[PDB]
Design an enzyme around this catalytic site. Sequence first.
Site, PDB file in Angstrom:
ATOM      1  CB  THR A   1      -1.184   0.128   1.779  1.00 38.56           C
ATOM      2  OG1 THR A   1      -1.660   0.982   0.868  1.00 38.56           O
ATOM      3  CG2 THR A   1      -0.214  -0.318   2.467  1.00 38.56           C
TER       4      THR A   1
ATOM      5  CG  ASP B   1     -17.391 -27.625  33.731  1.00 46.95           C
ATOM      6  OD1 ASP B   1     -18.368 -28.442  33.636  1.00 46.95           O
ATOM      7  OD2 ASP B   1     -15.697 -28.826  34.180  1.00 46.95           O
TER       8      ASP B   1
ATOM      9  CE1 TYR C   1     -17.560 -35.306  36.280  1.00 49.45           C
ATOM     10  CE2 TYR C   1     -20.546 -35.493  35.625  1.00 49.45           C
ATOM     11  CZ  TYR C   1     -19.378 -34.396  35.828  1.00 49.45           C
ATOM     12  OH  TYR C   1     -19.639 -33.129  36.139  1.00 49.45           O
TER      13      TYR C   1
ATOM     14  CE1 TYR D   1     -17.252 -32.249  38.324  1.00 46.62           C
ATOM     15  CE2 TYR D   1     -14.576 -32.618  37.690  1.00 46.62           C
ATOM     16  CZ  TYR D   1     -16.078 -31.986  37.432  1.00 46.62           C
ATOM     17  OH  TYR D   1     -16.962 -31.705  35.723  1.00 46.62           O
TER      18      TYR D   1
ATOM     19  CG  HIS E   1     -20.309 -29.368  29.168  1.00 51.88           C
ATOM     20  ND1 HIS E   1     -18.592 -29.566  29.242  1.00 51.88           N
ATOM     21  CD2 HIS E   1     -20.417 -29.222  29.886  1.00 51.88           C
ATOM     22  CE1 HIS E   1     -18.066 -29.275  29.934  1.00 51.88           C
ATOM     23  NE2 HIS E   1     -19.540 -29.259  31.033  1.00 51.88           N
TER      24      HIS E   1
HETATM   25  C1  LIG Z   1     -16.339 -35.744  32.534  1.00 51.40           C
HETATM   26  C2  LIG Z   1     -16.434 -34.643  31.727  1.00 51.40           C
HETATM   27  C3  LIG Z   1     -17.746 -34.975  30.826  1.00 51.40           C
HETATM   28  C4  LIG Z   1     -18.435 -33.583  30.287  1.00 51.40           C
HETATM   29  C5  LIG Z   1     -19.664 -33.465  30.092  1.00 51.40           C
HETATM   30  O1  LIG Z   1     -19.240 -34.687  28.437  1.00 51.40           O
HETATM   31  C6  LIG Z   1     -18.623 -32.459  31.675  1.00 51.40           C
HETATM   32  C7  LIG Z   1     -17.567 -32.504  32.727  1.00 51.40           C
HETATM   33  C8  LIG Z   1     -17.094 -31.260  33.356  1.00 51.40           C
HETATM   34  N1  LIG Z   1     -18.281 -31.116  34.096  1.00 51.40           N
HETATM   35  C9  LIG Z   1     -16.645 -33.059  32.951  1.00 51.40           C
END
Ligand SMILES: C[C@H]1C[C@@H](CO)C[C@@H](CN)C1
Lengths: 546, 546
Positions: free
Chosen positions: B122, B334, B382, B465, B523
């Site tokens: 330019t 999250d 979980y 957790y 998620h």
């Molecule tokens: C094990 C994972 C799965 C995910 C969802 O697929 C959410 C995450 C955080 N809460 C944990």
Amino acid sequence: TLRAAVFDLDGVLALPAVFGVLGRTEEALALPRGLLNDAFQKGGPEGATTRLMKGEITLSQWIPLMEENCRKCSETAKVCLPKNFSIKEIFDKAISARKINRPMLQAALMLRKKGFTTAILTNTWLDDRAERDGLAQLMCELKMHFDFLIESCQVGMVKPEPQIYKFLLDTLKASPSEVVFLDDIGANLKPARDLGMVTILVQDTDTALKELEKVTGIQLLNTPAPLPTSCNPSDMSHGYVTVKPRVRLHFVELGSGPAVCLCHGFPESWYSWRYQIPALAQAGYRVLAMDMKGYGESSAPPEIEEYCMEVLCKEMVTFLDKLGLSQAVFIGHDWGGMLVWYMALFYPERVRAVASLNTPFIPANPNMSPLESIKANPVFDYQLYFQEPGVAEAELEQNLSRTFKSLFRASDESVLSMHKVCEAGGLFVNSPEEPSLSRMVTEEEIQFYVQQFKKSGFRGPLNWYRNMERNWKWACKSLGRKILIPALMVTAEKDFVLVPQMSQHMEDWIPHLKRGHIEDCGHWTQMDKPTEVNQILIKWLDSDAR
Amino acid sequence: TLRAAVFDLDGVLALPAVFGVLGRTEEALALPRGLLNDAFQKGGPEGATTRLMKGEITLSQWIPLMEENCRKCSETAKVCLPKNFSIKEIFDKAISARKINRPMLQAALMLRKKGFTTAILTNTWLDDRAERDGLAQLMCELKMHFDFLIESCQVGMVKPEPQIYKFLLDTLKASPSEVVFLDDIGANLKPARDLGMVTILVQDTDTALKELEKVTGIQLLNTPAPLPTSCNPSDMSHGYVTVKPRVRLHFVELGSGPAVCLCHGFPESWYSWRYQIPALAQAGYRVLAMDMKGYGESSAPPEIEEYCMEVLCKEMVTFLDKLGLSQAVFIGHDWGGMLVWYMALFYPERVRAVASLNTPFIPANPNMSPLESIKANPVFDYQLYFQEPGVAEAELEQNLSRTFKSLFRASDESVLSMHKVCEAGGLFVNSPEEPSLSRMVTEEEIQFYVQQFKKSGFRGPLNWYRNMERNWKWACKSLGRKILIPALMVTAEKDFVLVPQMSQHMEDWIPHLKRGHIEDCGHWTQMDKPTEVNQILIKWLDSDAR
Ligand SMILES: C[C@H]1C[C@@H](CO)C[C@@H](CN)C1
Ligand SMILES: C[C@H]1C[C@@H](CO)C[C@@H](CN)C1
């Protein structure tokens, strides 16, 4: 034997007291006397104010509850509040008016300097008002100077409950006999004294400080003007930007607001701005204190050409690009001051404003080689000694502690004869092997520069002086330009290398140039006269760079 | 065979063209036709405009010279310019109106994605106007997408001089046959064609792009909506703050304006905000994308208690304190979303505004232990598997590439059965050993998470957790509070763990809550629907957090 000092916030570290406004407002609004203060006190330990102070509720949830009990107080007093009456407005104004009690903070600073553990113990609330930032800033400025901040709303305890006092002793890790406690409320002072704490009731500051000094045996009142807040290297946010494959730039970052990029000289560090960083951040700026290429945690490539002004300036533009900054205010000292004028001439769109300490802006002479020009000035002899790669590196790297102790001295302290450095054989040939410590620096501050220079040495720093011809050829391309962006030139009376006289023709190239002058100031401007530097820069920033 | 594409700025990458305004202004001011355009062209290669374009003089030095030759042009034309007439005003307005030609930039982006070397060539000036920042920002946004930016005023050469073209080929390291050159000026196109370069005269964009695609054999017109700009980790400014003796927090930083603190979830990184960082910075914000405690370049102490919400929040307050920030907008996803609501409840004075992706704000049930509550929801199984220290670490750390490939999947791609994770023996027992690559992520992006997680593993992340009881007890202290600062809740339609339904009662605790909803979003919100996320956050930031 005392070793800890505790201060209240309202009526002690901050003035005027917020609750004192309840009285002011009723006197101004000709309301019955204590009417508003009784509404504030309604329910005592079970009332809305205690719930607020313990953190059960927020200030915005408390406002309508204070309003409900403001009526209840006027109902019995057989009166009625006006149609304009607003608790939100009253507290917004009261909080906004409340500023730091500077002599009180200074006393706390002196005590902490003498080895005391200091703390703020306060009955406060969770502020969710739209205007909450004002108080957030005050708490931020205040807390930094203390070992602990204990807030009623965070600990779920309140003054005068005796549990907060036991929590305080536990936090301090000290017995009540080792602690001084200052408060403006007699009722809140009582439990501290009950445990055997030295207690000071604070009405006027001076009397409280006279009591404070009598009890500690340390002079706190009428003491000399203290130095501005400095930086502890390990408490800073450290930033790193890769400007090209082999070059990474390090910087220290503090504050919010317009970006202010600080550029040190030779042989320095980001740490040379230690007294400006907290000050400029406090004045409302985002400070970026650089380790210039070749220094500290920044990359130091060996090649001479890597340190020519053109490359250095291009890299500072990339630095802005990678940080996502369209502009920054550029403030330089010595070699940084020179770079800062070149940023203004070649990249005016990226420079919000330009300021230089000591370094004048002198256009290149196209009818004289730079080596002739340097030869024409007896004070610039040291620069010819710096030309041959390895020589000055060997002398400067030989004993680092001696290097900085010899260099970093006030105008009334020189050990370095700048005359005939080449013929003499070096910079420190006339200097002691164990120089005395300058009044400008502590032994700890010298050791930080020593530790910084152990990483790359003096090759990169000395290379800044090894591009005279390259810099001159580049500078000649700008000979038809003028600097028309906001600019500040700060001269130091006693800088015998970068003499104020050298800056006298600058208005020819920078017509709107603003100035600052520092009397009894040597070359190391920032550490020599920190208070004056901050005063000049803040005033200029608030007027021309915002 | 083509391998390089060169674009002009004015009339090509930016529209409307600046010189086109000379015509507009004379037509609007009923001045003779070309009068202003001839004044601009006065002297040709020896005139003020060439001196300006070659960088001999700045734009502010050029303004009065354009004014002098504006008279000279009207003198011969036997006319007279009005009393309001201002060149500064004309160019200020013209530059301000000139915006990026988005389909042109998209074509350059697609070409660079297909392996092309791209450049902006330019004819421009050194802008020292008080309004220069507008253009600085445009050049910044533009340059980032190209391998090279060649500016006439920087190289001291100009179009149509043939030296700038040889400089271009030299910069590109390519022969003229390998290069496409796009320009809106026929005269400036001529020397490029003279060397054998493919040349496109640009009038309307679509035709130019049809010519561009015919000549390159790559679809550039009518192509799908591209993804927002991402982050290359090595091109970012990396920041580090020590919040306590053993804890250091890492972050990526981009832009200027109000501070926006981005808080990722489990098991993530600052890199999970790769699509938001350039977007939010471009929208006028200072982005701070964290590596949350336990992740990437941030410290990861082993103790469980180091990851309770109270400690994490206190550390984020220290992070602000050490950076000199009185507030930041807090945006979380999250686990980061959960932290962000707790920052709002416990530190409202430090939170400018709060936004959460997927994570609802649900007040603690004081009449139910958190382990009972987690048991009450089949999707939260979980979390019980995550309780015993070492178990989930072993499974998640076994094969990192498999871990992220299994986790980071769109709603229509799941390989993970969240039902009976404990009874099944683990998260990946039903998952392939070599999972397929999700449409949301490249192999390169998976490897960045793999490399990040090699430093500390999953102990620190899983500890987030492991404080259910501690977090619950702390949360109960806030049960009487409401969130009254600006707040945004963003729900993801297909998040089967953090379901939109879970957020339905939030207005009871956050009455002024604003919302956003993303359809067909799983998620991993930020990488799943980056365009929609940026649109929702920017709109909310500009209305409620400024
Ligand atoms: C094990 C994972 C799965 C995910 C969802 O697929 C959410 C995450 C955080 N809460 C944990
Ligand atoms: C050798 C040092 C001496 C110092 C003045 O004491 C100035 C400095 C940077 N120009 C070089």
